[PDB]
Each structure stands twice: as structure tokens, then as C-alpha cells.
Amino acid sequence: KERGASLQHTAPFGCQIATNPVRAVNCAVGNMPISIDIPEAAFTRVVDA
Amino acid sequence: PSLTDMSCEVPACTHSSDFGGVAVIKYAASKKGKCAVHSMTNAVTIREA
What we know:
part of a larger assembly; 2 chains; mainly beta; two-stranded antiparallel sheet; virus like particle
């Protein structure tokens, strides 16, 4: 009767809190390093472009 | 044939030891015929003759 507000309504950074399993979704905090290994087939030489 | 009003541009150059450089030469040929491309310096070698 006196729970108050849950996390999905009070979490910072706009996080969405879910259960089963407990998840925090779409927290706009920090940044992400991304490393991509691209095969040679995807590149086009300057003389063909 | 005699060629005049000719220029050269190198889209890419890589000293990779397997002909890593490619050059494009714009030419105004006097007439249709066969000529022989040669490099005037020792430092660079041309694949085609």
C-alpha cells in the first residue's frame, strides 16, 4: 500500500527497468567503442570509383 | 604516333613491392597506334611496356 514509485519511473538517464529477467534498457550514459573488421571485398579502389 | 598536351595524376601510391601505385595519364594522340611507356628514373618501375 506504500510502495512509492518504482525504478522505471525514477531511474536516472531515462533507463527503462524490466523484470523476468531484471533488465535496464536504453540508458543514455557513457559511450561505446566499436571495432569493425571489414573484408577487402567491400572496398573499391579510387581509380574504379 | 606523337602525343602532346598530356598530364598525369596518381590516385593511389603504396610502396608495397607488388605494383602498389597506379597512375592515369591524359593524352592527345596524333593518330591510332602503339607506343612504349618507360620510366626515366630508376626509383619507380612500370608494369606495362
